[PDB]
Amino acid sequence: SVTGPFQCPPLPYVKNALEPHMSAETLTYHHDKHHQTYVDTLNSIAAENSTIASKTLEQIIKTETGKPFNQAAQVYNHTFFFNNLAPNGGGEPTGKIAELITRDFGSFEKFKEDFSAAAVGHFGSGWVWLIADDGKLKIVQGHDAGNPIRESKTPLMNIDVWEHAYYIDYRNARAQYVKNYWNLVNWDFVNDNVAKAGI
């Protein structure tokens, strides 16, 4: 009844809050089944590995291998993903990311083209990330649980392209899912990530 030590943070919005772009049924399975289960399994390992209980998700991402890495990475990836969406989100970015997007991709339209193409093209399960590398914006793909924190890097935005993220709502139409993700982006969260990094 006291389970831990890792926890699955609650969604920052109610289940129907992202409709029609992402369904309540999707949020329920994706968060309450997939996300929560990754945390449960990690905890199972933590119970028998005091080294893995002593480490932050980020330290496990940087330092672990195999299943423990995959689990910690996935727990972080989903928390970041769900934080990265919002009921009053979407549309063109404002504030500092808007400036940096212009700086590094020329325009939001071009950034949107690049990021969508990466997300639509990723073969198999994975993630697409907007990262700040050494103060510079870059789009990187993470196959399976791949997370750029393992390298030097700072995540700013992501999209989950594992099939479970969209199959209930879009079946195999990943491109339609990616299109709809732009209506959901939480630019306030993205801008907080910018602010926290030096950039």
Place this chain on the structure above:
Amino acid sequence: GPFQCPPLPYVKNALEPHMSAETLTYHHDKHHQTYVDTLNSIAAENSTIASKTLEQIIKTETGKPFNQAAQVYNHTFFFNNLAPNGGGEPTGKIAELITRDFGSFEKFKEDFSAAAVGHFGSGWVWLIADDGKLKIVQGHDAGNPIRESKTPLMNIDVWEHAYYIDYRNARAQYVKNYWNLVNWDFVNDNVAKAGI
């Protein structure tokens, strides 16, 4: 052309309740067909790829062309690996080889299931003949043991699209129902052709 998506070996609801008509429609009419289409589009621009068999591309190709050719084969194999009136205990040569190489069908079932439930991300679990020996091997993403000149006998798709409509996140329920569908005739045919 040059590549084609073979029709399903049975009508869309033939596998219910284990696998739904809706799953067969999406998996075959959408995923499988689209792999073929995309490979065909690459073939129109790539005379080398257009010159090759699917198995030649699986053995020697790279990048996107490999992934597509392998997925075309993998899905044809998989849909052939299922049958209405399949399932149950194997008979014939495969039954003998499984007892030989795993001790019992039950032990093989355990091993194969654990591999399929265990596979992280998108992939395939194969039963293979390797110099006449049965082995279980995992193919991540489009991985196919023909690339290592091994002979495929059985497979299961553990890409989420294979089960999500019918089982959502419950992959282990999908894997258990798969045993009710296995087309042992197809598996024995593969055994016969391999000469093992």
